[PDB]
Swiss-Prot record, chain B:
Site feature (Important for ensuring that an appropriate proportion of lactose is converted to allolactose) residues: 180
Triggers of expression: By allolactose.
Residues of the full protein shown: 821 to 1024 of 1024
Source superkingdom: Bacteria
Subunit-level organization: Homotetramer.
Name listed for the protein in its UniProt record: Beta-galactosidase
UniProt organism field: Escherichia coli (strain K12)
UniProt record similarity statement: Belongs to the glycosyl hydrolase 2 family.
Length: 409, 204
């Protein structure tokens, strides 16, 4: 995946936008742009609106100005994105026709959605057992374990949807950059994986603080709190609210506290193993390739649709992989998640990736592991023998907030 | 402000008010604010605020609440950065501790009146019978942001009835590399798009 990031940063055409005018700059020192068009696409949350191509005639170290036509200006809700591609129409000795050599993206206009959703014809019903809070609406059932405090299972008809409960996750299968030169024999305490392991991040057990059900006029409200401890020290606290409304939508609100003096965690999100194994993964966000907070400049905001196999990156030493960032919608089988999040999705658990030394020893697990993070630590890589993740990409904030909506389709 | 949603619910141990406003100007929606007020058996009001800011409007000066209190107390007591005025890009000299000052010292008499007297990184603020807890920046004065904005000299300011309280989840840097061009650096601009902050309002 890193190659695209190299391609994007090393590109020979740099862009600036002012109003509807694009300043293209040439960083070539000897040749004109004698084999280059600029293609441009304007899109509203992935749906294309306007297109077009304009010839490029930039002297070496020169500038060309390009005025766009009066773009489409819809009242419909969403963010408008401009994307430009530089395309070589002709083959070279090193490339074939239609090769893309450079690109750049901008947000244009956003119109926030102000409409209230239409009132539902139905109210979701709460069923209280000693062991469970269960919620029914139509063909759909939700079950919350009152001993654990997690969503244990969801139903569409007789069909169960989960193999593992939906739980918080503050750890990732360590990257080569998290490990450095640390070895089982000779530990390096300065490596991120060792700081994490020493602090109990990987061995932290969840302790239920609160687990409460309430009925509202139009919804059921499940409210929970867990503390993750290691040998007496409280590392993380997660407070959630699950709000299931008449439309079959489950709004999850997460509010996490991280102890100031524990090593900054690798991620703040949820994960679960779903029962479904679908062939395609469709998301609105940065893509199409794998991208991380400190490696997402080559990625672009659009609708992407790839096979599940392409959402796993076969690094020979298995680690956390296949994350996409800045995602507003994710689709997998009947499931849809909405919000503002990072995700990865594969047949391989963070547990299996962490414990397996070679990609050829991995086995597909029963279902599909889904990690949804509100926040993810940078990957670093200025070197691979000392901590390389810059301060801006470490999760030091202390308090974190993220919101998901889980619904069916 | 245009009211979108205003609902009440009764829970086992508390009452929950949920609201949603849109701030508009000539057809353009600039901000949306979704809140939950949760008043529980202990007389404590827990307010959750979730704001959207349009990506193409200028990054706003602050994101918080404000009210005029009836109370005028003689002292202000807070746990956070102080004792002096401090802003996000000017708080290195400030130190985290419990600060107790006269309300006079919570206002900075700049000759040209502006926003002033903010303290940042505060977990607890105490004024008269009121306590607010959370993670916020505040200023507290007898002078509304409106009076300060409309007044050109400090000697023409008049104490209004009661006490104006600004509690911000987030507050833009003050800049100052020069004062004839924008000088607040990107990291101190409110460009995130979605913001969240949480207060609890208390009696003592
Ligand atoms: Na491994």
């Amino acid at each position: 995946p890193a190659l695209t990031e190299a391609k994007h940063q090393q590109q020979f055409f740099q862009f600036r936008l002012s109003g509807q005018t694009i300043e293209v700059t040439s960083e070539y020192l000897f040749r004109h742009s004698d084999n280059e068009l600029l293609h441009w696409m304007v899109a509203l949350d992935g749906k294309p609106l306007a297109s077009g191509e304009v010839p490029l005639d930039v002297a070496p170290q020169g500038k060309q100005l390009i005025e766009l036509p009066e773009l489409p200006q819809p009242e419909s809700a969403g963010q408008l994105w401009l994307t430009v591609r530089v395309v070589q129409p002709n083959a070279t000795a090193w490339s074939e026709a239609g090769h893309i050599s450079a690109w750049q993206q901008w947000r244009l206009a956003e119109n926030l959605s102000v409409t209230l959703p239409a009132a539902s014809h139905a109210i979701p019903h709460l069923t209280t057992s000693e062991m469970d809070f269960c919620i029914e609406l139509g063909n759909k059932r939700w079950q919350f374990n009152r001993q654990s405090g997690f969503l244990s299972q969801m139903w569409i008809g007789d069909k169960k949807q989960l193999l593992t409960p939906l739980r918080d996750q503050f750890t990732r299968a360590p990257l080569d950059n998290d490990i450095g030169v640390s070895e089982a024999t000779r530990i390096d305490p300065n490596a991120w994986v060792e700081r994490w392991k020493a602090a109990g991040h990987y061995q932290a057990e969840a302790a239920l603080l609160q687990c409460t059900a309430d009925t509202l006029a139009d919804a059921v409200l499940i409210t929970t709190a867990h503390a993750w401890q290691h040998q007496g020290k409280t590392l993380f606290i997660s407070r959630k609210t699950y709000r299931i409304d008449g439309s079959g939508q489950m709004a999850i609100t997460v509010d996490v506290e991280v102890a100031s003096d524990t090593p900054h965690p690798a991620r703040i999100g949820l994960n679960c193993q779903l029962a479904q194994v679908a062939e395609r993964v469709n998301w609105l966000g940065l893509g199409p390739q794998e991208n991380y907070p400190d490696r997402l400049t080559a990625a672009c905001f659009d609708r992407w649709d790839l096979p599940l196999s392409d959402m796993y990156t076969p690094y020979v030493f298995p680690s956390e992989n296949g994350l996409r960032c800045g995602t507003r919608e994710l689709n997998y089988g009947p499931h849809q998640w909405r919000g503002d999040f990072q995700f990865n999705i594969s047949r391989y658990s963070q547990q299996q990736l962490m414990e397996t030394s070679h990609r050829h020893l991995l086995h597909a697990e029963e279902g599909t592991w889904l990690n949804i993070d509100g926040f993810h630590m940078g990957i670093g890589g200025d070197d691979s023998w000392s901590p390389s993740v810059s301060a801006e990409f470490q999760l030091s904030a202390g308090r974190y907030h993220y919101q998901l909506v889980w619904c069916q389709k």
